[PDB]
Symmetry: D2
Subunit: 184 residues, 4 copies
């Protein structure tokens, strides 16, 4: 349970840093999470993330803090919502978006054969926009229901005051880290 | 020169953290800078900033790294451009924007008596939007030329893929930190 | 009553076309409305407007339909809200926005002792954006409260899916049209 | 040639009004154009359109002016670009966008073996946004290349200051109008 979660993620984070993925880190920082399995995964508190995320350091990246349950808020909701459809995928990571990265992700998905969906906040029902915290889950579902298969990659373009993101899911941190490795 | 710059900023950053300004930290992180005086201030390399900025940690903030020249890129250009109008103001800091913070900043500026200007990227000439790195300086000038006096505070609302910011300037880090202290 | 209104608006409209203000017409078309008096003016049905508005023809403008009560809706609701603060200002017109046009208006505002204000859908709380047709009222109220004087001109920039607009008011069509001319 | 074009578009327009498609008209108004043939169709001047377009009247629509060559500009440039890829598709119409309308189009697209594509001004390089009237060509090219088939319908969501739009094409006005009807 918990220890295994804390160890596997803590390792992935260390390896993530070692491969030095600077071009992939957004401005808000990258968080890498690993949730508890259902039905115990009821809140972001049940999901382990990097406290302070991982930010661009010099010509490298740095995890500001240690792995702790309740560390991540936005990515946890995403993975948590995603589990409502694929309960085995309790790991995820958010990386920077840009034409190059997405084009290159598309190509690789094409090759290694795996789905990528998305969601556009411009197509979001005002009412949902109104309710706080309802947007991230809305996006995940929209994206998930968009295609027929399971999307390993879900992204969205920017919106007023909000930057674009690329989310990549895995059943555990090692698998997530593996997709990232490919991206290079 | 340099040592004095490195010391004064390094102290302010330590004090900034101590006052624990979590509500004021944006998602992209807060950077606090102190530039070299003209004519030596020719690039962001001549400006000292926090490497990795200062991010929300727990119910607090944390400066990811040490103070170094060339640490800041976006705020340095802002302060650098600002100096073209008020060469004595080589310090600045960017904090989170929101109705509350701005309303409260307005009120205080009213009280302690000091100017606040702004710029809107929606009123930005396409051509400028086109040239990379020309936007931050454009904003600063627009904001500076907007009012007749010197604006200690310059902010801007969000835009597609970009969040809103509140910039506050001072002639040195101590003065900047003092405006922030008031904000509480 | 109604006849005096109908006659006046109908004449101002005919003269607006006559002066040929093509560059001041927006893509959505310009509308010119004149409301009944308080408390009669209880809805957009109590306001007279151009059916099908006035639109760009060739290198000229053209009124699409005749003046009728209820013809307008948006511009009508705007003047309705505006009358809560200045009951005698029952006439208004909406014209194309542009840096060039708006600056002209400023100059003239200064050169003629007229006041101009604005509002921003970005500073609009999400809650209000959720209630259909609650935005126009919000805008007008916002712009009027932004200054102590009565704003003859109220504008706003573009928003996702919505174009910028400049609304000019007056006691009657003559006053309103009278201003258009200075601008021209 | 020109007369056959004039006559056909003029009749389709008269019938469009006749079917009363109010809910399918945008605030900027709907235009219906029919171009000459390649290589004759060398500019928007070689394309026939509704002067002053067709706009919303009451609970009905109305053509503001007669059919003339060069009447259109945007819709005309769109079909011009579209003809570089499908030379025989010289007719097009632009209609109001909305989740409800677009979904209907999808269903019908599926239920009638028609293809639909789109473009996004957000994925538009800043360089292209800088060159006046280079966006429409960009959009059409983008949407057409997004899929291997010919897209009968090309749409796009709203952008700052610009509304969303759904463009439907056809070999001639009958084909185009023919589709509008299914939608209705």
């Amino acid at each position: 349970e918990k220890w295994r979660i804390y160890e596997e993620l803590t390792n992935a984070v260390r390896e993530f840093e070692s491969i030095n993925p600077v071009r992939l880190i957004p401005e808000v920082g990258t968080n890498f999470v690993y949730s508890l399995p259902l039905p115990y995964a009821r809140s972001t508190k049940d999901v382990a993330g990097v406290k302070g995320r991982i930010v661009k350091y010099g010509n490298s990246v740095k995890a500001v803090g240690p792995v702790e349950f309740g560390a991540s808020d936005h990515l946890a909701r995403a993975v948590l919502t995603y589990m409502r459809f694929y309960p085995e995928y309790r790991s995820a990571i958010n990386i920077r978006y840009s034409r190059e990265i997405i084009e290159e992700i598309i190509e690789i998905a094409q090759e290694r054969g795996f789905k990528v969906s998305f969601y556009d906040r411009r197509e979001e029902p005002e009412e949902i926009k109104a309710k706080e915290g309802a947007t991230i889950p809305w996006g995940i579902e929209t994206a998930i229901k968009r295609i027929k298969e399971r999307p390993d990659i879900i992204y969205h373009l920017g919106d007023v005051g909000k930057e674009p993101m690329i989310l990549v899911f895995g059943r555990n941190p090692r698998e997530v880290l593996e997709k990232i490795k490919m991206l290079i």
